[PDB]
C-alpha cells in the first residue's frame, strides 16, 4: 500500500482513508490527476462512497474533501461518477452541519450549492436534517457572528436558498421545520442573540412576482413621499412554539444584545401597542392595591399591643377589630407574595451566577415575604421577637415600592441606578473598607490598656471609627491611652485614609456608573417594561386571552398551492423625501 | 538595527524589513551559522535587546515571524498546524521566552527598571499574553490561594495574641501554668517568626534588584510596605526584651500596617485588582502635593 499511497502523495501517475480521499486531500492547485485514474480503474473493477471510519472524523467522504477545497471541477467530477458524524463536526472544531449542501452553504460556495441542489445526475434534499435535527437554515443562522459583511452574506445565502427551495418545492414550508430541541430558524436567531439575522427575517420583502408570498414586511399604499407598511407577526406576539418576544425577554441574559434587540421594526412598536391598549390600566391598578396594602400594614404595625406576651386575646373595641382585620390582610398579602415568588423560580430555574444580576426586583419581593412568614411563625409560638421581623418586612416593602417606577421613563432610570451600585460599586468597596476599619480598630483597642467609658470594647471602638466616615466623630473620644502621640497619630492617619481618600474615591466610582447607566440604561428600562408587559399578559390569560390579541387578520396574497393567504398583520407608517 | 529602532509605523516597517532581508541573505550564504544567538559584550541577544530597550515593534516582529519560502523556512517562529475552513491553528517557538540560559524575554519585560516605555502593554504580543495566562491557570492559582490563606491565618494569630497581651507589670513576663498563657506564648512565637521571615524575604529582594532611589517607591511599593511592616515588629522585639513598655506602640503599628497590607493579595482579581492600584497612585501623586 505504501507505493500506491506514496505515488498518490507524489502526484505521479484505523483511520481507513482511501486513495481517493488521500489523493483529494494531498492535492496542490488541483493537480491530482491520478484521482480520475483511480476512479476510472475503480469503475472497471462503492469505492467513491467509502469514508473514514474513525470516530473523530467519522463519515467524511470524497464530496466533503472537494467541497472544503472550493474545487468546482473536482466536485462536479465526483458527483457525476452522506453525513460526517465525527466529533470534529459535532457541536478545536468546525461546525457546519452534516450534509454536503450544508458544507457548501456555510462556506459561501453559492455556485456549488446551486450545482448540488439542481444537479441533473443527483439532486440534494433541501429539508434533510442531521443528527441534531438542524436543517440548512439552522446551520446558516448558527454560523452567524454579527458582522456587517458576515451578516451580509449569511442573510444573502439564506435568501437565495429560501427562494431556490420555494422555486423547486413551493408546497413545503421550510422555515416551519424545527430541530430536536424544537426551535425554528427565527426562534433560534432570537434565542442565540444573533441580532442581524433576526432583523433580516422579521422585515424581509421579496419583490419578485410569483415568489412574493414568502415575505413579511409588505406595503399597503403610497400617495406621495409617504407609504404605509404592514408586517406579518405570525409567531411574534403568540404561537404554539415559543414566541420571539418571550424568548428575547425571558432569556437567561447570556444573550448579548437583549437590551437593544427589541429595536427591530415590529417589536419596538408592538410592545408599545400592548402598553397603551390594555396594560397601562393594569399597571396602575396593581400599583394602587400595593399602595393601599402598605397603609394597612403600616397602620396595623404602628398600633400593635405593647403589654404582655403574644398572642393577644381580642377586645370588644372597634380599634381592636380594625387591627385584627389589618393583620389578616397583611398576612394574606405576605402569603400571596411568597407563593407568587416561589412559583416564579420553578418557571425559570435561574442559575446562581445570574440569580442577582437578572432577577433583583423579584428576589427582593420574595425576601420581604420571608421576613413576615417568619414573624407569623414566631408570633404564635409565644415570642416577642416577631417585632424585629415585622419591622424589617415593613421597611423592606416601603423601599420595594420603587419597583413600580418601571413604567415611567424619567424615573425608571433612577431605580435602575440603585440596583447597579448596590451590586457592583458597594460590594467591592466594603471588601476594601472593612480591612482598614478592622486593622485600625484592632490597633486602637490594643493600644489602650484598660486592664463608664468602657472603650476597651472591639464593638465600641469599631463603631466610633465608623463615625469618622460620616463626619460625626469626636477626636478626643478617650483619655485612657498611655501614649498620646501614637493614639493621635493612628486616628489622624485613619481619618485621612478613609474620610478623605476612600469616601472621595467611592464617589468617583459612583459618578462613572451614573454616567454609564444614565446614557445606556435607556434600553434596559425598555426591556424591563417589556417583561412587565409579558407578565401582565400572562396573568390575565383567562379573562381576555384571545379578546386582547394584537394585530388584525388580513389578506396578503395567494399561497402557491392555490389557496388564500390570511395572516395577523401590524400596520406602520413612514415618510421619506429623498427617494421620490 | 534593533538599537536604531524608535517605534514608528514606517520606522518599525523598514527596520523590520531590513532585519528580515539581512537574516535571509545571511542564511542563504551561511546556513550553518546561527546569527541571532550571537551576543554583545553585555551578553544580550537581539531579541533580548529589543525586549530590554522597550522597542515594542521589533519584539512584535521577532516573536511572531513566519517566512514562507521553501528552503529558508527553518528560521521562523509562528508556524501553522492545520486549516480546515475559516479556522486555522498556529504554533509558536517559545525557545528562550519562558526560560533560558540567557535572560528570558518574560523576566526582562517584568523585572525591568520601569524606565522601559511600554512595559504595561508590551505583553500583548502573540505568545506572551497567553503564555502568562497558561501559567496562571495551570499551577499558580493554587499557590496564590495557599499563600493568601496562610497570611489570613497568621493575621488571626497576631491579632488574637496582641489583643490579649498582659497589662500588669513590666516586660518580659514569666509564664503561668494556664492554657491561655501557653496559647499566647505560641501566638507570639508564630508572629515573631513571620516577622523575621518577612524581614529576610524583603532584605534579599533589594540585593537582587538594587532599585534606584528615584524609582524606589514608584515600582516597588507593595514590597516596601511589607518590609516596613517587619521593621516595626523587630523593633518591638528589641524593645520588649530590654525591659520597656514602649513595645506596644510598635506592635500596634505592625498590626494596623499588616491588616491594611492584606490588600496586596487582590492582585489576582481583575475587578478588585484595579482598586488597590488606585490607593497606591493617590497616596504617591495626589496626596503629597
Ligand atoms: C384584591 C385583588 C388583589 C390582586 C391585585 C394584584 O396584582 O396586586 C398585587 C399586590 O397585591 C398584594 O400583594 C396585596 C394582597 C392583599 C390585599 C389587601 C389590600 C386590599 C385593599 C400587585 O403586584 P404584583 O405585580 O402582583 O407583584 C408585585 C411584585 N412581583 C411579584 C411582580 C415581583
Ligand atoms: C508554613 C508555610 C509558610 C510559607 C508559605 C508562604 O509563602 O506564606 C507567605 C506568608 O506567610 C507568612 O509570612 C507567615 C509565616 C509564619 C507562619 C505562621 C502561621 C501558620 C498557621 C505568603 O506570602 P508571600 O508571597 O511569601 O509574601 C508576601 C509579601 N511579598 C514578600 C510577596 C511582598
Ligand atoms: C476585614 C476583617 C474581618 C474579619 C477578621 C476576623 C479576625 C478576628 C480576630 C480575633 C480578635 C479577638 O480576639 O477579638 C475577640 C472577639 O471580638 C468580637 O467582638 C468579635 C470579632 C469578629 C469581627 C469580624 C467582623 C475579643 O472579644 P471577647 O473575647 O468576646 O471579649 C473580651 C473580654
Ligand atoms: C495634619 C496635622 C494636623 C494636626 C496635628 C497636630 C499639629 C502639629 C503640632 C506639633 C507640636 C507638638 O508636638 O506638640 C506637643 C504635643 O504633641 C503630641 O502630643 C503628639 C503630636 C503628634 C501629631 C502629628 C501626627 C500627624 C500625622 C498624620 C498622618 C506639645 O504640646 P501638648 O503636649 O499638646 O500641650
Ligand atoms: C440584594 C439584596 C438581598 C439586599 C436585601 C436587603 C437586606 C437590602 O440590602 C441589600 C444590601 C445592602 C444593605 C444595606 C445597604 C445597602 C445595600 O440590598 C438589598 C436590599 C436593598 C434595599 C433597596 O434596594 C433597592 O435598590 C430598591 C430597588 C431597586 C430596584 C428594583 O428593581 C427594586 O425592585 C424591588 C428595588 C432596602 C433593603 O431591602 C432594606 O430595607 C433593608 C433593611 C436592607 C436592604 O441586600
Ligand atoms: C508609602 C509609605 C511608606 C507609607 C507607610 C505607612 C506609614 C502608610 O502611610 C504612607 C503615607 C500616608 C500616611 C497616612 C495616610 C495616607 C498616606 O503610605 C504608606 C502607608 C499607607 C497604608 C496603606 O497603603 C495602601 O495603599 C495599601 C496598598 C496598596 C497597594 C498595594 O500594592 C499594597 O501592597 C502592600 C498596599 C497604611 C499604612 O501603612 C498604615 O497602616 C499606617 C499606620 C500608615 C500607612 O507612608
Numbering used by the authors:
A (entry chain A): 114 to 126, 152 to 183, 188 to 223, 229 to 238, 243 to 602, 624 to 752
B (entry chain B): 291 to 579
Paper text:
To address this question, we chose to study transient receptor vanilloid member 1 (TRPV1), which is the receptor for vanilloids and noxious heat. TRPV1 is a homotetramer, where each protomer has an N-terminal cytosolic ankyrin repeat domain (ARD) and a transmembrane domain (TMD) of six transmembrane helices (S1-S6). The TMD is composed of a voltage sensor-like S1-S4 domain (VSLD), a pore domain (S5, the turret, the pore helix (PH), the selectivity filter (SF), the pore loop (PL), and S6), and the amphipathic TRP helix. Vanilloid binding at the S1-S4 domain allosterically acts upon the pore domain, driving pore opening.
Various strategies of 3D classification of the 4 °C dataset consistently resulted in three distinct classes with nearly equal particle distributions to overall excellent quality. For the three classes of RTx-TRPV1 at 4 °C, we assigned class I, class II, and class III according to the size of the pore opening (class I being the narrowest). Notably, the models from the 4 °C class II and 25 °C class A reconstructions have similar overall conformations (Cα r.m.s.d. ~0.6 Å), however local differences near the SF and the CD suggests that they represent two intermediate substates (see the analysis below). Compared to TRPV1C,RTx, the 4 °C intermediate state (TRPV1IC,RTx) exhibits rotation of the TRP domain while the C-terminal half of S6 (S6b) rotates and tilts away from the ion permeation pathway so that the diagonal distance between the side chains of I679 in the S6 gate is larger than 8 Å, consistent with an open conformation for the S6 gate. Rotation of S6b occurs at the π helical region between S6a and S6b. However, the SF of the 4 °C intermediate state adopts a nonconducting conformation, as there is minimal change at the SF with the diagonal distance between the side chains of M644 of 6.4 Å. Therefore, because both the SF and the S6 gate adopt conformations consistent with conductive states and the M644 flipped conformation is observed in the final open state (TRPV1O, RTx), we tentatively assign the model from the 25 °C class A reconstruction as an intermediate open state (TRPV1IO,RTx), while assigning the corresponding 4 °C class II reconstruction as an intermediate closed state (TRPV1IC,RTx). We reason that the two intermediate states at 4 °C and 25 °C represent substates in which their energetic and conformational differences are too small to be separated by cryo-EM 3D classification. Upon lowering the contour level of the cryo-EM density maps, we observe density for both M644 rotamers in both intermediate state 3D reconstructions, but the density corresponding to the non-conductive conformation predominates at 4 °C whereas the conductive conformation predominates at 25 °C, supporting our hypothesis.
